[PDB]
Design a protein around this ligand. Structure first.
Ligand SMILES: C[C@@H](OP(=O)(O)O)[C@H](NC(=O)CCCCCCS)C(=O)O
Ligand SMILES: C[C@@H](OP(=O)(O)O)[C@H](NC(=O)CCCCCCS)C(=O)O
Ligand SMILES: C[C@H](O)CO[C@@H](C)CO[C@H](C)CO
Ligand SMILES: O=S(=O)(O)CCS
Ligand SMILES: [Cl-]
Ligand SMILES: [Cl-]
Ligand SMILES: [Cl-]
Ligand SMILES: [Cl-]
Ligand SMILES: [Cl-]
Ligand SMILES: [K+]
Ligand SMILES: [K+]
Ligand SMILES: [K+]
Ligand SMILES: [K+]
Ligand SMILES: [K+]
Ligand SMILES: [K+]
Ligand SMILES: [K+]
Ligand SMILES: [K+]
Ligand SMILES: [K+]
Ligand SMILES: [K+]
Ligand SMILES: [K+]
Ligand SMILES: [K+]
Ligand SMILES: [K+]
Ligand SMILES: [K+]
Ligand SMILES: [K+]
Ligand code: NA
Ligand code: NA
Ligand SMILES: [Xe]
Ligand SMILES: [Xe]
Ligand SMILES: [Xe]
Ligand SMILES: [Xe]
Ligand SMILES: [Xe]
Ligand SMILES: [Xe]
Ligand SMILES: [Xe]
Ligand SMILES: [Xe]
Ligand SMILES: [Xe]
Lengths: 591, 466, 265, 466
């Protein structure tokens, strides 16, 4: 039974061999014989488009012949990529707002690096936009103020009218005033509002078009856990237009919903224009009873709520919906598969924090640092290493996932074996060593596979992530090289900070994030931690890792991005088959 | 030069507390009680042991409905955790723990004091409250003035609690992040110790609207809760905090120093019993009756005089003492709010009274209202942002640092404290809802709860210096 | 003076590491380079050209009264005020006689007044120009430089992890380093610029020589850092590099929890 | 409990300054000189009268090439300003004015001191420097401690300057915004007094990375400029500011207090002459020779001992005193930078020495390096962000508050100060470029320029208290 990177489980594709058309175990290659960028369909097409652009605007742009010392890019193979594990999927074939239904089990192979660049991939951009345009609030206080101050009864009928009105004004219309401007419905068709509740009788009394159905979206055991936390309360989940956050930031969401929800309360309950109660609605939405995807950031990297930088790792873990899919519930031979949850949750975890945030907010440029991150969700490499650690631990400790005692010693044992297996394959397959040519890719992958195995096997997220940092000596003392110049800042320091309680060192992994100082600057890490946190919770029988409200809030088929199968969605964007929201086609000239 | 003009300080019962006090003796740069008030806000924090214990026990750490779940019934979920169900599911407990913090509050307070104290008898205090659920902490001036910041009581208390709990119960390495979370909440992913269990009366040090605004970032609900709704004591606390804030902003300087000191003395300390006298005279009437009483008192005291009589008979008044006229308008402003919002026993109208008491004053005299535009300006912004969809909230959530109400130079927030003190429970975001712990714990500090008498006694101690 | 042990050296690989980093061990010269070819390869200055300066000579800049500064003699480059120049080398993952972190450890133990960065694909060394030239004699002419696996390249450095070419040479996108008549020659300088005549580096070492002198562990040749069965096994049953790695992790974790916890450990 | 262990404090010449000093006597919570240093930073500001005068004169207000243009030759521009050119063009002057601020610096200094003074004998100081172009101001402790913030010297000086200039020259109403701009710059559109002419050594109070980081938001170039490049005095100033910062962060507490105090004593104050002795022994060598000297000194002093000898002959060492071992690694770290960057007289390699001195230490002993990961961690981040396209800059622009270098618990910034002090002028963003005014003005304060002797003398004054 070969490694998954040499033979995918069901399609039997050889992901590494397909890059070269040569046995990846052979240490031999011919260089300078590919015609440079001519071997790339996307860069060749880009060159021809660039010539037209230069002629039209009068300023040169993309020009591959500018490559240093006459050496065009492409002196070696510009490898293509295969999305990991698409041939092992069997569910999620429903049509989505972004594309017709994917046929589960169909692979996406031959993608070029530029197809998985955040700048060129609308699925990756929409993934982030869906997170930041979301506003979540408890409605108890607004209903309390209406009943106690205003004097009107709140019933399923008034809640339904409130949601019909909020869905009319959140993106397009006006209700109370004469002569008022409105937005073109075509530009905001992705904007809407819903609610969820732990009260099954209330859920059954509402118009289901406005309901996030916990009983439908989740398996029984997970629905029971979430409903027990939500209790007899109503939570609103509103998504403002993607186009609106694209003209500003995610901090607009709570303010925007503050305006529209206040108006829908005024109109659904006939409250006079200017009544003092109005201020309680906006205060409740913006501050009184609110859940944010991201918290504010300090002056150097100043941000209001809902920027990728303020999103706690556990919130990135819980907005992923792989935890409620059949693949994650019975993929490990009829049993729960926490590894499927880790490897999927780390895909937006890596792409959003590294490409969406570190790159598209803190640094930038035309590359999107794409090849660094592509390596974590393609060709079954990290997949093979992760499953290797799980199978090893299940056989050694004779138990299931989440049941290996969470001792420091067991963490070290598993980490040593996964590091060994990662190094064994990079050493025995020159073609794989060349595919993941950057040391950071190889270093992050052995550290992530080790953490995934420890997290999935012990159910302990801090211990799972401790295994990541222990890979620093294991990697360094073997190869005598690690990653890029500033890659091991956090790895070195977290070998000590993981179980430290000093002021800015101690903090559970669920609540760490891109503002934890050690993690604020470098790629190839945060996404891995995000996957580990999600998998550790999954392995110990939990429905989420950090916030049940976030988990329920993203169980929604009306989301533009499919949060259940992110690796697949990023591949669909790679095929140019993902239609994002926010485009301004309705009000611009033809093209 | 010293503000040598003499004033009499009266209590809220309309009886003199101290006579012949130079204005200089009530200023924040001189008055020991006002200075001690700022010192108490800087050095005091509360530790919520009950909250910390609950967070660790159930996994509901921090805020926003966060929950790190531990599943004690894995074998009853109907799932297989082993391929083909070879091994039966076994539960684990990895994110929670039960520590008897509340039961051990007395010993915890002792260990916390030893860690915070720099030298014996340095004035460090730890008091057990709410039968062990809360500790009131006040660090020494020695510790507090080590560096330049005001957050040392907050930072040291959180680390001291975390370290002493890890040591006292000899916890294993797994507990380090969880115990840190029990006290710090989401710090350092958040700048604030968000959802933590170490609380200061001051806001996070990243939240100022400008330099020197720390003493202004205190909600009116906190002030009302700490003074237990005693109207003029809430006005005195709010006005005194705004007075300290204006010194730190650099506005109690040069040709504006007397103007700023008089706002504090006249509106905040019932100087010459003006506030009390105006409320007494017009209490059975409307806002307009306070306008009549304010103009009459300004004339009686020689602060204003008739300047010119227009052909219609309308008289323009002139300010013989412009800074004192402004201060009399500020006193009339808080009196008007007491009469208007006091009659309704409902705070909402405070924003309307702020606007129209000033507008009526100008139309009545031809003299500028409080702040030469800020009184009406904030009446407008504050009215708008307490009755519209755009932002804001009910009166009690505003402060001198809130973008909506920051503008007025110290005479606006005290009227909000007066109105919220008189409210009969007409709001949902009232003092009990937003400031319960603040009022129960910090309200026990005599200086915070009843500053009027403390300021007057301290002013009398140094009256002969000026 | 305490006598350094440098690092655990329980086998051929770690003993090779110790030799490279121990400054009291002479690195054997395996090739001769003319002054013209040597300077042409570096590419910063040519033979007979005057050294450029970034600041005036040290004696003219008015150094302040500072007793500690008097204890550290400046290098000749520092005394002259030479520009600080960078030289970059890349070691293949395939059995090199020196690897990236060993370069940092060796530089910090053998050369004075350095700046140096370790990356997976390259290693920089930045020193006052004349000091850098003296250091480069060790980097280019001794046993730590196999012409086919340790190459000089200032940018477009990819190749450390690439498959070897048909001649066993490490890939260079700019083709600065080529195989001609069995010899490795630089047909362009470290910056990829033209050279009047190629710089001959001689023959590469044979495969068995490379395996004998390498500092890297490799699973394919049966010499991984962590062997099958080592994970979880007692310290006495694993490589000393793994016993050292486990110890550093235990002490960083316990020490950072409470410093006193590692007392006597 | 008091840190009673005795240390000897040595000067930068390797001779003892004070013997038998308890570690407790050099801590920021006890030492009067360290406490006075923080007090000086809080209360001192510089007024750039030359800059203010030039901004008003030419209209080049604030920063970023801003210019409010006044056109004195409107009739020579070739334009018509009247329909059909009925009336010839006439120039106006509406955004600029010429005030002799520098020529009147002496009288302005007297007026500023009187405005800032609370009481005659309060300690307020105003000194005229640079022939009238700059004023050094130090407000009194009375004014500084009125409220809770550290920005009072900045806010009060900007307002006193603006008010006194408006009054002295009896300027018309048009001048108010322009004179305010001359001192405040873009405030309040900016939180900072951006492009203004009132400067503090501290950063704007909105800029901290966390609570208690104010004393850490000071660039290494400022420290080097203020100490005029005297290597160990720059190390002492940086280490002392980091020591105060760590107290304010809450990290000099409980089981971590001794560890934190020893970092300051050993690396920052040449305790027991370790730093000097290591540099003396290995000065003619490389970073590696400092590693050998550090391990040898730790063994000689009984701080470490052989734990176990592996079959190859490699010895694992154990820390008999873990906090002192960490402190000896911190001392060896600054010695290593002095030897390595000192040989090149070029600061850039400081980030490499920070990383590899620690990495070599671990490989040499089997003991953890400084900060159990932070020393190598910051060696990595600092190296990366001082040699790549992503951000950062030259060594001198980093500080304890910079996201790249904040992590280490007080032992990283002092090595940057040492390296930049030894630099021969190899950078463009060196101390002269970023901190000229800081060094010329604040460098005149003896305590800032030469803290080592001041700390040792103050420690000897209170050595019998512990
Ligand atoms: C008041 C304040 O909102 P909060 O009271 O803090 O929720 C502020 N908003 C605004 O200023 C809204 C301005 C636009 C709406 C009014 C247009 S006239 C803000 O977002 O910080
Ligand atoms: C360092 C700092 O930049 P400055 O040094 O402050 O210019 C910071 N940037 C970053 O952290 C860039 C992170 C992304 C680049 C590194 C990818 S490994 C920031 O924008 O605040
Ligand atoms: C450094 C030392 O080898 C650590 O020892 C662990 C294997 C066990 O720790 C015990 C306490
Ligand atoms: O070469 S560096 O490690 O600085 C950057 C890698 S993108
Ligand atoms: Cl409890
Ligand atoms: Cl806080
Ligand atoms: Cl006046
Ligand atoms: Cl400023
Ligand atoms: Cl600025
Ligand atoms: K070419
Ligand atoms: K539905
Ligand atoms: K709570
Ligand atoms: K636990
Ligand atoms: K007890
Ligand atoms: K103590
Ligand atoms: K103070
Ligand atoms: K607070
Ligand atoms: K009391
Ligand atoms: K062995
Ligand atoms: K001038
Ligand atoms: K003018
Ligand atoms: K004065
Ligand atoms: K400054
Ligand atoms: K200790
Ligand atoms: Na254990
Ligand atoms: Na020659
Ligand atoms: Xe990067
Ligand atoms: Xe390590
Ligand atoms: Xe990853
Ligand atoms: Xe308060
Ligand atoms: Xe008064
Ligand atoms: Xe070379
Ligand atoms: Xe070996
Ligand atoms: Xe400084
Ligand atoms: Xe020491």
């Amino acid at each position: 039974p070969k490694q998954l990177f040499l033979e995918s489980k069901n399609s039997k594709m050889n992901s590494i061999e397909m890059k070269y058309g040569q046995d990846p175990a052979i240490n031999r290659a011919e260089f300078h014989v590919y015609g440079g960028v001519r071997q790339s369909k996307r860069k060749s097409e880009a060159w021809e488009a660039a010539k037209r652009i230069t002629k039209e605007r009068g300023i040169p742009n993309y020009n591959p012949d500018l490559h240093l010392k006459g050496a065009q890019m492409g002196q070696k193979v510009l490898q293509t990529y295969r999305i990991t594990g698409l041939d092992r999927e069997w569910a999620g074939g429903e049509d989505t707002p972004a594309h017709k239904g994917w046929k589960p089990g169909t692979d996406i192979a031959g993608l070029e690096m530029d197809d998985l660049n955040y700048e060129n991939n609308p699925a990756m951009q929409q993934c982030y936009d869906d997170m930041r345009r979301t506003a979540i609030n408890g409605l108890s206080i607004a209903h309390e103020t209406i009943e106690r101050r205003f004097g009107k009864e709140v019933t399923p009928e008034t809640i339904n009218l409130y949601f019909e009105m909020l869905n009319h004004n959140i993106g397009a219309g006006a209700i109370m005033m004469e002569h008022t401007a409105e937005t073109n419905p075509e530009l905001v068709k992705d904007s809407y509002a819903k609610c969820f509740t732990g009260n099954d009788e209330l859920a059954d009394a509402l118009d289901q078009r406005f309901l996030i159905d916990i009983n439908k979206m989740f398996p029984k055991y997970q629905a029971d856990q979430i409903k027990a936390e939500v209790g007899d309360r109503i939570f609103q989940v509103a998504r403002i237009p993607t186009m609106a956050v694209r003209t500003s930031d995610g901090g607009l969401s709570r303010a925007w919903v503050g305006q529209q929800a206040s108006l829908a309360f005024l109109c659904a309950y006939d409250i006079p224009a200017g009544d003092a109660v109005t201020s309680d609605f906006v205060f409740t939405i913006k501050h009184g009873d609110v859940v944010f995807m991201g918290t504010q950031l300090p002056y150097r990297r100043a941000q209001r709520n809902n920027s990728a930088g303020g999103i706690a790792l556990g919130y990135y873990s819980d907005c992923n919906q792989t935890s409620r899919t059949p693949e994650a519930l019975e993929g490990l031979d009829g049993g729960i598969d926490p590894v499927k949850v880790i490897v999927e949750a780390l895909t937006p975890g890596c792409v959003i924090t590294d490409q969406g945030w570190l790159h598209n907010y803190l640094a930038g440029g035309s590359s999107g640092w794409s090849n660094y991150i592509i390596s974590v969700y393609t060709d079954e490499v990290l997949e093979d290493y992760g499953y290797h650690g799980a199978i090893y631990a299940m056989d050694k400790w004779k138990c299931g996932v989440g049941e290996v005692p969470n001792t420091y010693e067991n963490m070290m044992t598993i980490a040593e074996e996964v590091s060994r297996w990662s190094q064994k394959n990079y050493d025995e397959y020159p073609g794989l060593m060349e595919a993941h040519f950057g040391g950071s890719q190889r270093y992050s992958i052995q550290a992530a596979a080790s953490g995934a195995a420890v997290g999935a096997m012990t159910g302990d997220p801090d211990l799972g992530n401790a295994a990541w940092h222990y890979n620093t000596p294991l990697c360094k003392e073997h190869y005598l090289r690690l990653g890029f110049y500033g890659h091991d800042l956090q790895d070195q320091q977290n070998m000590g900070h993981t179980y430290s309680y000093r002021s800015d060192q101690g903090i559970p992994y669920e609540l760490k994030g891109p503002n934890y100082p050690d993690f604020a600057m470098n790629v190839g890490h945060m996404g891995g931690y995000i996957g580990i946190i999600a998998g550790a919770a999954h392995a110990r029988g939990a429905a989420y890792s950090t916030n049940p409200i976030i988990k329920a809030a993203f169980a929604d088929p009306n989301l533009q991005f499919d949060f259940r199968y992110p690796r697949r969605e990023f591949g669909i964007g790679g095929l140019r088959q993902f239609m994002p929201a926010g485009e301004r086609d309705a009000v611009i000239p033809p093209h | 030069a010293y503000l040598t003009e003499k004033i009499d300080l009266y209590g809220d019962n309309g009886k003199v507390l101290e006579s012949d006090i130079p204005l200089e003796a009530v200023t924040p740069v001189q008055n020991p009680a006002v200075r001690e008030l700022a010192s108490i806000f800087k050095r005091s924090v509360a530790v919520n042991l009950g909250g910390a214990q609950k967070a660790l026990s159930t996994g509901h750490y921090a805020n926003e409905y966060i929950h790190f779940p531990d599943i004690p019934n894995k074998d009853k979920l109907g799932i297989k955790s082993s391929p083909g169900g070879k091994y039966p599911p076994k539960s684990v407990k990895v994110r929670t723990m039960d520590l008897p913090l509340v039961d051990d509050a007395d010993d915890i307070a002792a260990r916390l004091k030893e860690r915070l104290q720099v030298n014996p008898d340095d004035g460090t205090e730890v008091r057990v409250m709410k039968k062990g659920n809360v500790l009131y902490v006040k660090i020494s001036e020695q510790l507090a003035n080590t560096g330049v910041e005001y957050t040392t009581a907050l930072t040291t208390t959180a680390q001291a609690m975390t370290d002493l709990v890890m040591e006292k119960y000899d916890l294993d390495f797994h507990a380090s992040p969880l115990v840190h979370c029990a006290f710090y909440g989401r710090y350092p992913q958040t700048y604030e110790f968000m959802g933590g269990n170490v609380i200061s009366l001051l806001a996070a040090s990243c939240a100022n609207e400008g330099p020197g605004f720390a003493m202004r970032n205190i909600m009116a609900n906190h002030i009302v809760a700490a003074t237990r709704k005693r109207t003029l004591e809430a006005v005195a606390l709010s006005s005194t905090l705004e007075a300290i804030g204006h010194v730190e902003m650099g506005d109690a300087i040069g040709r504006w120093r007397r103007w700023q000191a008089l706002v504090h003395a006249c509106q905040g300390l019932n100087a010459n019993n003006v506030v009390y006298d105006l409320v007494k005279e017009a209490g059975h009437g409307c806002t307009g009756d306070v306008v009549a009483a304010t103009v009459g008192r300004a004339l009686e005291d020689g602060i204003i005089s008739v300047k010119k009589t227009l052909p219609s008979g309308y008289k323009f008044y002139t300010a013989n003492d412009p800074s004192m006229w402004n201060a009399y308008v500020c006193a009339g402003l808080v009196a008007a709010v007491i009469v208007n919002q006091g009659a309704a026993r409902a705070a909402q109208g405070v924003s309307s009274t702020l606007l129209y008491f000033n507008d009526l004053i100008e139309h009545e005299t031809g003299l500028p209202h409080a702040g030469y535009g800020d009184g009406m300006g904030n009446g407008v912004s504050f009215s708008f942002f307490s009755h519209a969809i755009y932002g804001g909230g009910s009166p009690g959530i505003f402060s001198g640092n809130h973008i909506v109400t920051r503008h007025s130079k110290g005479f606006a927030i005290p009227v909000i404290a007066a109105a919220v003190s008189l409210d009969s429970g007409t709001a949902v975001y009232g003092p009990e809802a937003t400031s319960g712990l603040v009022g129960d714990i910090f309200g026990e500090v005599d200086l915070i709860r009843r500053p009027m008498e403390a300021i007057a006694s301290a002013a009398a101690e140094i009256k002969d210096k000026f | 003076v305490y006598q350094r042990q440098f690092l655990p050296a329980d086998d051929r690989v770690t003993k090779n590491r110790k030799k490279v980093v121990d400054p009291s061990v002479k690195l054997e010269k395996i090739r001769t380079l003319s002054d013209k070819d040597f300077l042409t390869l570096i590419g910063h200055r040519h033979l007979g050209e005057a050294y450029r300066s970034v600041n005036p000579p040290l004696a003219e800049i008015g150094e302040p009264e500072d007793p500690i500064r008097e204890l550290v003699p400046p290098t000749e480059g520092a005394k002259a005020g030479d520009r600080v120049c960078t030289i970059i080398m890349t070691d293949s993952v395939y059995n090199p006689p020196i690897a990236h972190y060993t370069r940092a450890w060796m530089y910090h133990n053998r050369f004075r007044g350095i700046d140096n960065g370790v990356y997976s694909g390259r290693v920089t060394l930045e020193m006052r120009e004349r000091d850098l030239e003296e250091a480069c004699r060790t980097l280019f002419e001794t046993e730590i430089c196999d012409a086919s696996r340790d190459q000089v390249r200032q940018y477009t450095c990819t190749g450390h992890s690439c498959r070897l070419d048909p001649d066993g040479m490490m890939f260079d996108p700019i083709e600065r380093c080529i195989m001609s008549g069995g010899n490795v020659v630089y047909q362009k300088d470290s910056f990829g610029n033209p050279v009047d005549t190629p710089i001959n580096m001689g023959k590469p070492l044979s495969e068995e020589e490379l395996i004998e002198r390498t500092v890297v562990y490799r699973t394919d040749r049966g010499e991984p850092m962590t062997r099958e069965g080592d994970p979880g096994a007692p310290d006495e049953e694993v490589r000393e590099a793994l016993q050292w790695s486990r110890r550093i992790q235990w002490l960083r974790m316990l020490g950072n929890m409470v410093p006193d916890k590692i007392k006597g450990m």
